[PDB]
Amino acid sequence: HHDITFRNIRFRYKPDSPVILDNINLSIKQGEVIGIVGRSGSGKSTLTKLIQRFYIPENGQVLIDGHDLALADPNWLRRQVGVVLQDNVLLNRSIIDNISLANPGMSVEKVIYAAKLAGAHDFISELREGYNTIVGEQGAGLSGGQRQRIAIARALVNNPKILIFDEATSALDYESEHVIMRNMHKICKGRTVIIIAARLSTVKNADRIIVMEKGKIVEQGKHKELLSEPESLYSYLYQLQSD
Ligand SMILES: Nc1ncnc2c1ncn2[C@@H]1O[C@H](COP(=O)(O)OP(=O)(O)O)[C@@H](O)[C@H]1O
Helix, strand or coil: CCCEEEEEEECCCCCCCCCEEEEEEEEEECEEEEEECCCCCCHHHHHHHHHHCCCCCCEEEEEEEECCCCCCCCCHHHHHHHEEECCCCCCEEEEHHCCCCCCCCHHCCCHHHHHHHHCCCCHHHCCCCCCCCCCCCCCCCHHHHHHHHHHHHHHHHCCCCCCCCCCCCCCCCCHHHHHHHHHHHHHHHHCCCEEEECCCHHHHCCCCCEEEECCCCEEEECHHHHCCCCCCHHHHHHHCCCC
């Protein structure tokens, strides 16, 4: 079964604005973990915005879980997709409030489950005020890597069938990165996952990597196969980011 399909998608942000996505064709199997790489401004984040129907394409269709999103219930769509946001944990609010910031009636049990997958439960549990800890500075002083694991738990709490990782805007501490990489298979288990990767190394082990350039998918495949394509943009990017 395919959880996500783009057919002939053309998109621009405003009536006269430049075309940002052109003739995008992609079909992602249920449970696939996809990495999307490409230079800044290639259209990676825009592709994810369309999955959520934040914007409507001028040509083509997006189909989610088989449903054309034009026809799909927007409430159902919002429940199908969890997004790991960057730098979006609310400082003036508690950890649990941050994690359940979609369904405030969210069971403590559901919150802790999502926190365990995210690898946040352990550090939260060792805080004086636990889940009731106010995230904010002088209110506790959590790190960016701790906050990022909180952001993962938030994304996971409603058990989304599709999980999207927005591009990383900062480096996290070794501890937090280690916990996340160790827990990734648990976080992704049973879900279709899209990771927008600043560094190609991040998605070396994805089922498939999609390479975007100037709003088109130029290359797609497994890491080893993309490196086998003689003059591939993938290899070029791989070389550029290499030590
Ligand atoms: N909200 C927006 N309004 C107008 N243009 C946008 C908006 N968001 C992104 N863009 C433009 O769309 C292009 C693709 O951006 P984006 O999808 O964010 O690329 P990437 O994620 O690969 O860095 C860029 O030229 C960007 O400036």
